[PDB]
Curated annotation (Swiss-Prot), chains A, B:
Gene3D superfamilies linked to this entry: Glutaredoxin
Family, similarity comment: Belongs to the peroxiredoxin family. AhpE subfamily.
Gene source species: Mycobacterium tuberculosis (strain CDC 1551 / Oshkosh)
Active site: C46
EC number assigned by the record: 1.11.1.29
Name of the featured protein: Alkyl hydroperoxide reductase E
Anything else known: The active site is a conserved redox-active cysteine residue, the peroxidatic cysteine (C(P)), which makes the nucleophilic attack on the peroxide substrate. The peroxide oxidizes the C(P)-SH to cysteine sulfenic acid (C(P)-SOH), which then reacts with another cysteine residue, the resolving cysteine (C(R)), to form a disulfide bridge. The disulfide is subsequently reduced by an appropriate electron donor to complete the catalytic cycle. In this 1-Cys peroxiredoxin, no C(R) is present and C(P) instead forms a disulfide with a cysteine from another protein or with a small thiol molecule.
InterPro entries: AhpC/TSA, Peroxiredoxin_AhpC-typ, Thioredoxin-like_sf, Thioredoxin_domain, Tpx_Peroxidase_subfamily
Record function comment: Thiol-specific peroxidase that catalyzes the reduction of hydrogen peroxide and organic hydroperoxides to water and alcohols, respectively. Plays a role in cell protection against oxidative stress by detoxifying peroxides. May represent an important antioxidant defense against cytotoxic peroxides, especially peroxynitrite, which can be formed by activated macrophages during infection.
A GO molecular-function annotation: peroxidase activity
PROSITE patterns cross-referenced by the UniProt entry: THIOREDOXIN_2
Subunit record text: Homodimer. Forms both dimers and octamers; a tightly-associated dimer and a ring-like octamer.
Lineage of source species: Bacteria, Bacillati, Actinomycetota, Actinomycetes, Mycobacteriales
Amino acid sequence: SMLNVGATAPDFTLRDQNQQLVTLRGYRGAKNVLLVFHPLAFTGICQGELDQLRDHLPEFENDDSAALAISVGPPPTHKIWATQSGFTFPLLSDFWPHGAVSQAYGVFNEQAGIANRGTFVVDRSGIIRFAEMKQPGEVRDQRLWTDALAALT
Amino acid sequence: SMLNVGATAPDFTLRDQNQQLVTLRGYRGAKNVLLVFHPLAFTGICQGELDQLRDHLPEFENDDSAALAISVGPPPTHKIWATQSGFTFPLLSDFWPHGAVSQAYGVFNEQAGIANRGTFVVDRSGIIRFAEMKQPGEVRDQRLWTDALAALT
């Protein structure tokens, strides 16, 4: 049920770790956007994936591109996790309604109540140009993300 | 509405911070149970309340009594929070379905997606003998909790 390439990316307005509202449409005309859905703060695979994003942030957050992480945790969880891990990119809360944005992108695990490892690249017109979804026990290849953003510069 | 004194405490089975299963019925015939519902890990007032509980734990967790903290966070959140705070009592996850136990006890905040500051004492036969609910911005008086437990030894 993952939204595929060519679809309009569902707009959302979610709180980041500072309780600031972030809207996907705010980036239109300005930047390509990488959306990194993931299961849960303070779990091993998620830590590894976001640590790698952190460690390569200039490839993902720059004049051409922005990166947003999205999970079902509320802002205080994300704030502690980001501060302790050195994450400076936005971590957005798909918290209440629980998983609504993850559901809209077709990447919600209804059984477990978490997003799967869904990744999208949204172009400057708001269209999905890259889409994948791995299971919670898998790890994503971030080369695909940089390959996808490079095609839209 | 909050369940009242006299009512039978709804049964539940929830995961603790170590992903072990805790059931309310398990304590029947053995211990009085203090149920401490609270909004969110890693927030100020919740930290104060559970730190006070921690600092006086032998008054709540002993031969006669058990104490269970319940919130909408998942176990990994509660594991980190408990490790960093030195909490050795169970923190239970009312995570998915989101707030279901909190709703059964009548202490869920539907607008915010969190439990209010609901507290119950369940006697050895499963009957609610103490019941309160404060708002997220309020702080409970833990003297009432120790008094309630002391009446039931």
